[PDB]
From Swiss-Prot, chain A:
This is Stromal interaction molecule 1. Changing R83C: Found in a patient with autosomal recessive hypomaturation enamel malformations, nail dysplasia and frequent throat infections; likely pathogenic. The chain holds residues 344 to 443 of 685 of the full protein. It is linked to Immunodeficiency 10: An immune disorder characterized by recurrent infections, impaired activation and proliferative response of T-cells, decreased T-cell production of cytokines, lymphadenopathy, and normal lymphocytes counts and serum immunoglobulin levels. Additional features include thrombocytopenia, autoimmune hemolytic anemia, myopathy, partial iris hypoplasia, hepatosplenomegaly and defective enamel dentition. Acts as a Ca(2+) sensor that gates two major inward rectifying Ca(2+) channels at the plasma membrane: Ca(2+) release-activated Ca(2+) (CRAC) channels and arachidonate-regulated Ca(2+)-selective (ARC) channels. Plays a role in mediating store-operated Ca(2+) entry (SOCE), a Ca(2+) influx following depletion of intracellular Ca(2+) stores. Upon Ca(2+) depletion, translocates from the endoplasmic reticulum to the plasma membrane where it activates CRAC channel pore-forming subunits ORA1, ORA2 and ORAI3 to generate sustained and oscillatory Ca(2+) entry. Involved in enamel formation. The microtubule tip localization signal (MtLS) motif; mediates interaction with MAPRE1 and targeting to the growing microtubule plus ends. Transfection of STIM1 into cells derived from a rhabdoid tumor and from a rhabdomyosarcoma that do not express detectable levels of STIM1 can induce cell death, suggesting a possible role in the control of rhabdomyosarcomas and rhabdoid tumors. Monomer in the presence of Ca(2+); it oligomerizes in absence of Ca(2+). Forms homooligomers and heterooligomers with STIM2. Interacts with pore-forming subunits of CRAC channels, ORAI1, ORAI2 and ORAI3; this interaction is potentiated upon Ca(2+) store depletion. Interacts (via the transmembrane region and the SOAR/CAD domain) with SPPL3; the interaction promotes the binding of STIM1 to ORAI1. Interacts (via the SOAR/CAD domain) with ORAI1. Interacts with MAPRE1; probably required for targeting to the growing microtubule plus ends.
Amino acid sequence: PEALQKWLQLTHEVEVQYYNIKKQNAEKQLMVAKEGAEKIKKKRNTLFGTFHVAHSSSLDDVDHKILTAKQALSEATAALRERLHRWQQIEILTGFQIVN
Amino acid sequence: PEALQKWLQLTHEVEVQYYNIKKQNAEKQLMVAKEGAEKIKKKRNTLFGTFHVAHSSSLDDVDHKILTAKQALSEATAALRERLHRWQQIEILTGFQIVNN
């Protein structure tokens, strides 16, 4: 039991590190999307003036990268919930302390 | 133990998917870096002439994004090895067939 427990603890540590990366990348993806829209709003300001840009706000993110990024963050939140439940069930079935 | 096997199978799928995304992301980083340098080089050729560029080739990637990207991608090999060995051991210890293509 001792050996399998250590293999499982290593597997869990690996998954947590992958998850942290997934979350960090989703956060960066949202930042990048917002920066990109900020940049386009600035360029559209130079091309058409601020009033015009105010009455065509949807054009600063034509491909809706911001909303897509928000869905990405939602999935990260979902990933966390799935992982927590899965390892908890694994701990219960093995009788091993794997996570904490 | 039928339930545990399913939980472990799922865990393995999740890990393999993470691994592939990370590898794909590093591959994308390399592609992007090469692209960036190839673009700068073309621009420099027309601005300064081919003779000049042929004597200042390192200026196409001043921050070495290409070498940096290559270095990170190279780790994929060790990451694969570590994963295969760990799960092989888990399979042996549990007596379960867990791994996937």
